């Protein structure tokens with residue numbers, strides 16, 4: 001009788017043929033879209049199908065998301081939320097380097113802000129350890145509202161344990177899950193059938209974005225890396241641009 005309203009589209013740059021409105025039935029479960037960039041989602045309509053776009057400075061600077069244009073693009077587009085670096089914990093960016101960069105470039109955006117998306121790694125100096133060290137390096141000078149998690153693994157049990165552990169270890173922070181799926185060789189439908197009602201019940205999870213809101217054909221053509229690690233089971237769209245068996249869970 002009232003949607004949890006936590007679901008979002010992780011929307012790749014190559015999605016010009018696809019329509020985000022296909023996965024928005026107006027009920028209010030799907031509310032957000034991000035595209036790993038600070039330019040608007042490329043779509044078949046030129047719109048976001050009624051979804052709120054979250055700008056993302058996923059690199060420290062790029063040709064596609066120039067950090068010198070970050071403040072400009074927020075003002076032009078009127079984001080209510082911004083995401084920062086994508087997986088700096090496995091991209092040779094020290095917590096101290098991320099903290100300095102975040103204070104210079106993300107702090108000035110007077111809207112809701114997420115700390116960088118970290119991987120689910122527990123290997124030395126990665127994942128939540130990296131995040132804890134970045135918050136220490138921030139020395140109280142980073143303005144943020146959310147922590148940002150990725151998870152890829154082999155069971156719902158592992159995912160539930162990871163989110164409960166993340167909450168237990170950061171009990172005063174609201175969580176965005178900007179990417180999650182099983183790795184290749186599982187049943188992605190069964191995973192998301194378990195994950196959605198689990199996440200919908202957690203007050204401390206603001207948003208979750210299944211990897212990935214595209215078709216298998218587009219993922220294979222443009223992200224062979226993701227296909228080798230995740231497979232094509234978690235694609236929300238059919239190759240025609242309708243909802244997949246995972247897309248159908250978004251409604």
Ligand SMILES: OC[C@H]1O[C@@H](O[C@@H]2[C@@H](O)[C@H](O[C@@H]3[C@@H](O)[C@H](O)O[C@H](CO)[C@H]3O)O[C@H](CO)[C@H]2O)[C@H](O)[C@@H](O)[C@@H]1O
Nearest residue numbers: 011012013014035036037058064086212219222223226
């Ligand atoms: O040069 C081709 C094209 O590159 C685009 O930049 C892309 C990023 O947009 C892309 O972003 C996502 C990844 O960060 C994430 O890991 O996977 C998703 C789903 O596949 C990606 O969409 O990351 C790649 C590098 O992995 C970049 O090449 C530019 O935005 C675009 O202007 C340009 O035409």
Ligand SMILES: OC[C@H]1O[C@@H](O[C@@H]2[C@@H](O)[C@H](O)O[C@H](CO)[C@H]2O)[C@H](O)[C@@H](O)[C@@H]1O
Nearest residue numbers: 106107108109110111112113143144145
């Ligand atoms: O992210 C925390 C909050 O940040 C706010 O913007 C900050 C300003 O209040 C403060 O005066 O300056 C800093 C640095 O320029 C800003 O980041 C947002 O307005 C809030 O929405 C947000 O919750």
Ligand SMILES: [Cl-]
Nearest residue numbers: 119120151152
């Ligand atoms: Cl991960």
